[PDB]
Amino acid sequence: AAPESFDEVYKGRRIQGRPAHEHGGGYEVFVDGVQLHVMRNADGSWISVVSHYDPVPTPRAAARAAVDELQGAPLLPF
Amino acid sequence: MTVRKNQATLTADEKRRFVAAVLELKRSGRYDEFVRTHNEFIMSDTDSGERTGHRSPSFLPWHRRFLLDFEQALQSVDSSVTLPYWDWSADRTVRASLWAPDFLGGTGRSTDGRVMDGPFAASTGNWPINVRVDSRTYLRRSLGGSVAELPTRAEVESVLAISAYDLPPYNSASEGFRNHLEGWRGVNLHNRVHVWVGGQMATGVSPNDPVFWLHHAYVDKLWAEWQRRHPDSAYVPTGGTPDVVDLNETMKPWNTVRPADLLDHTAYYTFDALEHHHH
Ligand SMILES: [O-][O-]
Ligand SMILES: [Cu+2]
Ligand SMILES: [Cu+2]
Ligand SMILES: [Cu+2]
């Protein structure tokens, strides 16, 4: 079962998540309208391509970790 | 004679020649395709589907062949260069000579994580970050910023003592040596080092930082040390496993090499020192 969708402004960035060269994926995250690749691990944790080696519990946590990583910079699409 | 040496032991001439060869692969356009290939496998390898480069038993032979391709590209520029390795259990502080301005440069400044010194600092004009997801184009690091400490020798020894190479379900949930070295379970060796360097090393485009190669050259040495500790244990699985590269199956993207062809590193290089098997 897919996580719930979310939509908030975090650190001045719009982050959105929704159930849906890279894995044909089951959940989508966007940072200011640019899609961020995210992945779920077998234990139910999540990562994103900008914080790949550091699992976090949820897709919203991965989106927030990506906004923290970006330090205001635009994401480039994958 | 290809000998991979501990970074801490390189002479000034060897550091100079390694740096120059890496910068030339970058200038000529060849380097960035290594970054791209790695990010494509990072984004494609999944616990419940096809998995080859990561989170799977072929994590170790895949990176061994990826590093061989990179070392062969460096030797096409300067035949004397070999990949050094970073023993992050020994050389564990920001003051390690690895991070000096004559080798890889140091940590990034506090505001934006920008690396300010060494040959790969953006201000040199010689190290553009092209293949990227974070849109910034300068090398970034935050050594020790997102996790306090690198692994210790005792933690490494606890992983080297595990006798099974890997175990079903052959992914990030596995027990066994491979997943404890990779770090998705347990005290966490390889993943934690990526997190400790920070910057691009924490992302799927981690080969943007030249330290990637030295980290993986030491992960590769720990596989060799595991084999010397467990000469009776070998790669698994050994046939017919969906979505996982079995011992004698070929591996993407090369398709012309199998884990079986990569188990014995001495066909390709030796280390400065590698304990022999003992008790
Ligand atoms: O795993 O890089
Ligand atoms: Cu995907
Ligand atoms: Cu990798
Ligand atoms: Cu790695």
Ligand SMILES: [Cu+2]
């Ligand atoms: Cu013995």
